Design an enzyme around this catalytic site. Structure first.
Site, PDB file in Angstrom:
ATOM      1  N   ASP A   1      45.887  -1.362 -29.740  1.00 21.72           N
ATOM      2  CA  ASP A   1      47.342  -1.490 -29.828  1.00 21.72           C
ATOM      3  C   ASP A   1      48.012  -1.263 -28.479  1.00 21.72           C
ATOM      4  O   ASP A   1      49.247  -1.123 -28.422  1.00 21.72           O
ATOM      5  CB  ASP A   1      47.822  -0.451 -30.800  1.00 21.72           C
ATOM      6  CG  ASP A   1      47.225  -0.649 -32.174  1.00 21.72           C
ATOM      7  OD1 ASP A   1      46.696   0.383 -32.660  1.00 21.72           O
ATOM      8  OD2 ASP A   1      47.211  -1.810 -32.651  1.00 21.72           O
ATOM      9  N   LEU A   2      47.261  -1.197 -27.383  1.00 26.56           N
ATOM     10  CA  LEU A   2      47.764  -0.904 -26.097  1.00 26.56           C
ATOM     11  C   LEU A   2      48.485   0.486 -26.264  1.00 26.56           C
ATOM     12  O   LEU A   2      47.982   1.397 -26.956  1.00 26.56           O
ATOM     13  CB  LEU A   2      48.508  -2.051 -25.414  1.00 26.56           C
ATOM     14  CG  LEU A   2      47.655  -3.313 -25.345  1.00 26.56           C
ATOM     15  CD1 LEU A   2      48.449  -4.434 -24.796  1.00 26.56           C
ATOM     16  CD2 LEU A   2      46.404  -3.161 -24.521  1.00 26.56           C
TER      17      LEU A   2
ATOM     18  N   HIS B   1      41.156   4.145 -24.273  1.00 28.48           N
ATOM     19  CA  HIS B   1      41.193   5.258 -25.210  1.00 28.48           C
ATOM     20  C   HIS B   1      41.016   4.771 -26.621  1.00 28.48           C
ATOM     21  O   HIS B   1      40.253   5.355 -27.372  1.00 28.48           O
ATOM     22  CB  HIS B   1      42.545   5.984 -25.002  1.00 28.48           C
ATOM     23  CG  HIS B   1      42.679   7.212 -25.821  1.00 28.48           C
ATOM     24  ND1 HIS B   1      43.443   7.260 -26.951  1.00 28.48           N
ATOM     25  CD2 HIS B   1      42.185   8.420 -25.636  1.00 28.48           C
ATOM     26  CE1 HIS B   1      43.370   8.490 -27.434  1.00 28.48           C
ATOM     27  NE2 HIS B   1      42.606   9.233 -26.688  1.00 28.48           N
ATOM     28  N   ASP B   2      41.639   3.673 -27.013  1.00 29.80           N
ATOM     29  CA  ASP B   2      41.421   3.030 -28.312  1.00 29.80           C
ATOM     30  C   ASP B   2      39.951   2.666 -28.446  1.00 29.80           C
ATOM     31  O   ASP B   2      39.348   2.871 -29.489  1.00 29.80           O
ATOM     32  CB  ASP B   2      42.245   1.763 -28.468  1.00 29.80           C
ATOM     33  CG  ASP B   2      43.736   2.025 -28.809  1.00 29.80           C
ATOM     34  OD1 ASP B   2      44.487   1.040 -28.702  1.00 29.80           O
ATOM     35  OD2 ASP B   2      44.062   3.156 -29.198  1.00 29.80           O
TER      36      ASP B   2
ATOM     37  N   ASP C   1      39.800  11.774 -24.705  1.00 29.28           N
ATOM     38  CA  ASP C   1      41.173  12.185 -24.354  1.00 29.28           C
ATOM     39  C   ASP C   1      41.278  12.481 -22.906  1.00 29.28           C
ATOM     40  O   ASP C   1      42.252  12.092 -22.238  1.00 29.28           O
ATOM     41  CB  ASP C   1      41.662  13.368 -25.238  1.00 29.28           C
ATOM     42  CG  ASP C   1      41.802  13.011 -26.670  1.00 29.28           C
ATOM     43  OD1 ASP C   1      41.874  14.022 -27.464  1.00 29.28           O
ATOM     44  OD2 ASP C   1      41.891  11.854 -27.106  1.00 29.28           O
TER      45      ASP C   1
END
Length: 122
Positions: free
Chosen positions: A43-44, A64-65, A85
């Protein structure tokens, strides 16, 4: 999947610049990695906090996604979340080094807010 899938996923999800660089090349060439059946969805930064100064964090959000989605699919999210993270924070900080003075401080503050908004989950 190939036998080295777990090792490839780890190599794409370290905090280092070399890990980010490796991932960015794979993101440009996803089809070359088809054997691995990674989840490339993202989802950016659309589910992140506000970015009032418009710093370009989309690629940081995308990696990160990738870490979240692929470790969840492997059944070992909890053990890997912190590193993922941290890698996100490090990817954003690299963008901020392109700025000086007030904009550097503002970029780093936005990076911190983005990082804390995922750290709140564990």
């Amino acid at each position: 999947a190939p036998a080295d899938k777990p090792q490839v996923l780890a190599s794409f999800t370290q905090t280092s610049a070399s890990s980010q660089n490796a991932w960015l090349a794979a993101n440009r060439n996803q089809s070359a990695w088809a054997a691995y059946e990674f989840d490339w969805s993202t989802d950016l930064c659309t589910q992140a906090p506000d970015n009032p100064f418009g710093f370009p964090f989309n690629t940081a959000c995308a990696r990160h996604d990738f870490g979240y989605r692929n470790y969840k699919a492997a059944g070992s999210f909890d053990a890997n979340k912190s590193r993922i993270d941290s890698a996100f924070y490090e990817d954003m900080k690299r963008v901020c080094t392109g700025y000086t003075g007030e904009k550097n401080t503002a970029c780093n503050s936005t990076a911190w807010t983005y990082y804390q908004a995922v750290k709140i989950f564990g």
